[PDB]
Amino acid sequence: APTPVARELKAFVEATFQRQFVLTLSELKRLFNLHLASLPPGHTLFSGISDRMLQDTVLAAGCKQILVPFPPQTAASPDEQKVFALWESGDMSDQHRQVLLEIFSKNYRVRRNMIQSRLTQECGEDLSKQEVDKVLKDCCVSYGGMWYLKGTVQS
Amino acid sequence: APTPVARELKAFVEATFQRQFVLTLSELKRLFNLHLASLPPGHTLFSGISDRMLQDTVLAAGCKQILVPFPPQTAASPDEQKVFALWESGDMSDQHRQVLLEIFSKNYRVRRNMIQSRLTQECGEDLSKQEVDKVLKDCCVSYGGMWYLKGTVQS
Fold first, then answer.
1. A100 and A129 housed in the same domain
2. Secondary structure letter of residue B21 according to DSSP
3. Position(s) of the covalent cross-link Glycyl lysine isopeptide (Lys-Gly) (interchain with G-Cter in SUMO2) (chains A, B)?
4. Boundary-marking domain end, from A86, A104, A127
5. B111, B70: one domain
């Protein structure tokens, strides 16, 4: 079957705006071409990607167009005048920490997998290794293969 | 001393939990004593601060007590068994960015002071230079003493 483009575009747009926050369509297209250089031949993003699809991906990913009023005599191109910005950053680190703390309301120590499973069940199956690693680094210490809240191990 | 006790203690507790996330009372007291070592004689925080007031300040700041079930045979002291945790970061990055972005919906370029004043008016005087510097670094570029959204200067 066909290999759809939307998820691949979204991953690129999300990485780009989380890093840079504000950029023009011109810069987004430049960065997209650099992204293409990293992809293997046969990838779906080598064909049939319009500027419209890129803009729709930006708006689908919690970014907004900022209607900056360029001066009358500007030489900036249309793409150089179209400005997008990260609106909501989507950092759910507070919520992950709250789920972990709820575990330790009922447990002194647990396996990593128990934490991962609880987070996945509560917060979503797309939870990343980086997000779990962060909440563990912030809140916990491991001893003997078990995970404790910081400062609660008595070795 | 020159400043109010609870206000000063609250500032210390907030900064400490934003850095450490999870602390026992024992560890919080250790960190407090390290803090006192840095302060000038006559500072209000050399006043008697009871453990109860310290805990009350943590709880009043929005940190939560975590009722971790310590094992029956633990040798942890009572203060080592009282666990507290940051519930919300207080990261207001998105809101500051949205204030700034609305400035550039009506302006191509502005002075830094204009952005600062707008942030102060919308958020309040409780914006650290660190937050203002961050929102400027994330969204903007300076050229000739004026501030623009990233990517919009025709350099």
1. yes
2. S
3. 106
4. A86
5. no
Kindly report the CA angle at B119 between B113 and B122, in degrees rounded to 5?
A: 140
Data resolution in angstroms? 1.5
Residues B45 and B107 occupy one common structural domain: no
Co-location of A81 and A140 in the same domain? no
Closest partner residue to B67 (CB to CB) among A87, A105, A138 is A105
CB < 8 Å to B67, chain A: 105
> What type of residue is A87?
W
**Searching chain B, which residue's CA lies closest to the CA of residue A20?**
B138
Structural domain includes residue A55: yes
Q: With respect to residue B58, please indicate whether it lies within any of the assigned structural domains.
A: yes
Of A23, A71, A74, the CB nearest to B151: A23
Nearest to B101 among A85, A138, A152 (CB): A85
Question: In the Cβ-directed half-sphere of B96, how many Cα atoms lie within 13 Å?
Answer: 27
Q: Answer whether residue A155 is part of any domain.
A: no
CB atoms B76 and A27 under 8 Å: no
Domain boundary residue among A59, A86, A113?
A86
3-class SS letters over chain A: CCCCCHHHHHHHHHHHHHHHCEEEHHHHHHHHHHHHHCCCCCCHHHCCCCHHHHHHHHHHCCEEEECCCCCCCCCCCHHHHCEEEECCCCCCHHHHHHHHHHHHCCCCCECHHHHHHHHHHHHCCCCCHHHHHHHHHHHEEEECCEEEECCCCCC
Identify how the structure was determined: X-ray
Domain enclosing residue B78, as ranges: 5-85
